[PDB]
């Protein structure tokens, strides 16, 4: 298939699928090169006709329609979304420079704790990205370190390429099968903040299993962070986020105002 500069980013013909980078239940993400300018992009192909029914497909296109409208320097940008070759193809901003999962495992391998100054520098950006999504009535639905990308310049980019077989951060609303809400993203955010400081999930176990996990979540049983290295503000914020009741969790604006204030004084 031949190139068409008239169409721009809104046709598959103008892209070269370099490699696969993610695989979901309904989609597959690729690294591709925009043939028009040579700039590399992420290309997501969602199988809305073959893997989905009418309802799921309607909901999916509605979700993408709102997501393509998001514009924040800390949120992976959507360039295009079009139906071609019986799929919904999304042209996304590429962030190959690394992530927070990679950063955590690096400090873990080097047997070092991430300094609180550093924790807030990345965390404030993650809150900024999420404040924007929530303000435009959009849930992330999977906040985990692997989805918090870091560009070479140190800029955070919140994306999505994601006996257990459950989400990364199990929540009370998942155990009760109650459904995901904006306050579900707050639980994840509180867990992620803890993981930055502890170098492990709050409900991680050397020999972790479903029974033990549910017991720990019911009781909100996580080892407290060293007060010698991490401030009472950092520990209080984790504590008010990791709360069983979604309605008692703070909204993102509140988390974001705390991180802005904390970043400002720790730096």
């Amino acid at each position: 298939k031949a190139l068409r500069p008239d169409m721009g980013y809104n046709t598959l013909a103008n892209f070269r699928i370099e490699k696969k980078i993610g695989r979901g239940q309904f989609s597959e993400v690729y690294r591709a090169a925009c043939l028009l300018d040579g700039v590399p992009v992420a290309l997501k192909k969602v199988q809305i006709f073959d893997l989905m029914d009418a309802k799921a497909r309607a909901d999916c296109i509605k979700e993408i329609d709102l997501l393509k409208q998001l514009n924040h320097p800390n949120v992976i940008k959507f360039y295009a979304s079009f139906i071609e070759d019986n799929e919904l193809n999304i042209v996304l901003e590429l962030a190959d420079a690394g992530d927070l999962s990679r950063m955590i495992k690096h400090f873990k391998k080097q047997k070092r704790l991430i300094p609180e100054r550093t924790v807030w520098k990345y965390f404030v950006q993650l809150c900024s990205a999420l404040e924007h999504m929530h303000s435009r009535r959009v849930m992330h639905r999977d906040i985990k370190p692997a989805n918090v990308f870091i560009t070479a310049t140190g800029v955070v980019k919140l994306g999505d390429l994601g006996l257990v077989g459950t989400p990364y951060y199990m929540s009370p609303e998942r155990i009760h099968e109650n459904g995901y809400n904006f306050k579900s993203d707050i639980w994840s955010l509180g867990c992620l903040l803890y993981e930055m400081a502890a170098l492990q999930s709050p409900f991680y176990g050397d020999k972790m299993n479903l029974y033990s996990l549910c017991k720990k979540i019911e009781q909100c049983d996580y080892p407290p962070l060293p007060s010698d290295h991490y401030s009472e503000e950092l520990r209080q914020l984790v504590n008010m986020c990791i709360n069983p009741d979604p309605e008692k969790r703070p909204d993102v604006t509140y988390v974001y105002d705390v991180a802005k204030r904390m970043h400002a004084c720790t730096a």
Binding site: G98, R112, G154
Partner: peptide, 16 residues
């Protein structure tokens, strides 16, 4: 590039 700078420009904190 960020990770090489982050490890070098960070306080050495131990883990028990």
């Amino acid at each position: 590039g960020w990770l090489r700078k982050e490890l070098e420009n960070a306080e050495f904190i131990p883990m028990p």
